[PDB]
Amino acid sequence: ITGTSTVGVGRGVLGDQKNINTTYSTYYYLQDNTRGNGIFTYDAKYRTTLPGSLWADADNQFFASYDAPAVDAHYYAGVTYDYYKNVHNRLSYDGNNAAIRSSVHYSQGYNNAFWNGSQMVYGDGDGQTFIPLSGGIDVVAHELTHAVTDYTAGLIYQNESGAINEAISDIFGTLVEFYANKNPDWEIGEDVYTPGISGDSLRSMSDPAKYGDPDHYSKRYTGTQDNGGVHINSGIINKAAYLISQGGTHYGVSVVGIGRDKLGKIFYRALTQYLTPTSNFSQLRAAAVQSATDLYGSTSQEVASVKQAFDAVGVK
Ligand SMILES: [Ca+2]
Ligand SMILES: [Ca+2]
Ligand SMILES: [Ca+2]
Ligand SMILES: [Ca+2]
Ligand SMILES: [Zn+2]
């Protein structure tokens, strides 16, 4: 909508208070004009029609329980935008400040969230498996990252290319969580997964096998479920990324860690410069090796560590 930029205040899914950029014109809308061509958050009203209605509020205070998923979808989209801009010099998901749209209250008791090719979409969860999913900064960044991938590598969402697609979203979802520096970790979805169980998460990058996911190519899923295991076989790439950053020993192979920032630079360059729609694990290794070579030189520690990380997870 056309209006004036304003600043509201509210509470997120975890009950934390934060300021949000809004737009005033009769109502206060969840429309942040300070980032690119804007960040727009919508109410899906428990339906599956999209996007729903642009979120409107009478007083620019967002403290109702119904408000919480919207506050976080809006705020964390902002944080993700800032990460890509400040860290990778990327302006929104298309690199040309494309408007970012999210809908919350998607369907009834919906235990998921997704990027649909045009926007992010968040369920409220059923209160057992999930609470509203936009409450997870890694979840929001994971979904927005699918948009980045769509506009760059275009990794097909099936088999190995789909597993890379998924891992890329977990990698940058995590790097965004670290960027915001609020209880950061190498787990995925811990803030919104199973309100009844402490200490768990949907996936682990540090130890994928903790939640049933492979951490070595020899243990890769070869069947047809989950689009050829896109959220399963991502564990192999997540483990490699974790190793590149943090180092360690894994199946008797030692990796010298080079830190998160360098992990981010290498994978961002791989994604935007080398990967293709049909890239497999082997091609990701090469893309990452070449990226690290461009950035730090072929004889560098960074290149050596990428090679050791892929060695450790059995990807040549
Ligand atoms: Ca209000
Ligand atoms: Ca966390
Ligand atoms: Ca996390
Ligand atoms: Ca839990
Ligand atoms: Zn995903």
> Measured between alpha carbons, how far is 235 from 238 in angstroms, rounded to an integer?
5
Active site annotation includes 88:
no
The catalytic position among 74, 88, 105, 143 is 143
| CATH number of the domain to which 149 belongs | 3.10.170.10
User: Based on the domain organization, do 132 and 237 belong to the same domain?
Assistant: no
User: Based on the domain organization, do 42 and 179 belong to the same domain?
Assistant: no
CA of 141 to the centre of ligand 4 (A): 19
Asked which of 97, 125, 154 is the last residue of a domain, the reply is 154
Ligand nearest to the CA of 197: 4
User: Based on the domain organization, do 22 and 150 belong to the same domain?
Assistant: yes
CA of 232 to the centre of ligand 1 (A): 41
Resolution (A): 1.2
Nearest to 72 by CA among 37, 102, 117, 27: 102
User: Based on the domain organization, do 31 and 142 belong to the same domain?
Assistant: yes
User: Based on the domain organization, do 170 and 272 belong to the same domain?
Assistant: yes
Taking ligand 3, which is a single-atom ion, which protein residues have CB atoms under 5 Å away?
A: 138, 177, 185, 187
58: in domain: yes
Nearest to 69 by CA among 125, 118, 22: 125
Report whether 197 belongs to an annotated binding site. Answer: yes
User: Based on the domain organization, do 163 and 311 belong to the same domain?
Assistant: yes
Report whether 166 belongs to an annotated binding site. Answer: yes
DSSP string, the chain: ---EEEEEEEE-TTS-EEEEEEEEESEEESEETTSTT-EEEEE-TTSS-SS-EE-EESSSEE-SGGGHHHHHHHHHHHHHHHHHHHHH---TTTSS---EEEEES-SSS---EEE-SS-EEE----SSSBS-GGG-HHHHHHHHHHHHHHHTT---SSHHHHHHHHHHHHHHHHHHHHHHTSS--SEESTTTB-TTSSS--SEESS-GGGGT--SSGGG---SSHHHHHTTTTHHHHHHHHHHHHH-EEETTEEE----HHHHHHHHHHIIIII--TT--HHHHHHHHHHHHHHHH-TTSHHHHHHHHHHHHTT--
User: Based on the domain organization, do 193 and 305 belong to the same domain?
Assistant: yes
Taking ligand 4, which is a single-atom ion, which protein residues have CB atoms under 5 Å away?
A: 193-194, 197, 200
Asked which of 133, 154, 175 is the last residue of a domain, the reply is 154
223: in domain: yes
> Measured between alpha carbons, how far is 24 from 3 in angstroms, rounded to an integer?
5
182: in domain: yes
Report whether 43 belongs to an annotated binding site. Answer: no
1: in domain: no
Report whether 158 belongs to an annotated binding site. Answer: no
User: Based on the domain organization, do 131 and 175 belong to the same domain?
Assistant: no
Domain range for 238 is 155-315
Q: By what method was this entry solved?
A: X-ray
Ligand nearest to the CA of 60: 1
CA of 197 to the centre of ligand 4 (A): 4
254: in domain: yes
User: Based on the domain organization, do 45 and 184 belong to the same domain?
Assistant: no
CA of 40 to the centre of ligand 4 (A): 29
Asked which of 131, 154, 177 is the last residue of a domain, the reply is 154
User: Based on the domain organization, do 138 and 46 belong to the same domain?
Assistant: yes
| CATH number of the domain to which 166 belongs | 1.10.390.10
The catalytic position among 88, 105, 231, 250 is 231
Number of domains in the chain: 2
CA of 183 to the centre of ligand 2 (A): 5
245: in domain: yes
User: Based on the domain organization, do 198 and 222 belong to the same domain?
Assistant: yes
User: Based on the domain organization, do 137 and 254 belong to the same domain?
Assistant: no
Ligand nearest to the CA of 163: 5
Long-range contacts of 203-206 (CB under 8 A, 24+ apart): 203/170, 203/231, 203/234, 203/235, 203/238, 204/238, 205/170, 205/171, 205/174, 205/238, 205/239, 205/241, 205/242, 206/239, 206/242, 206/246
CA of 59 to the centre of ligand 2 (A): 31
Active site annotation includes 231:
yes
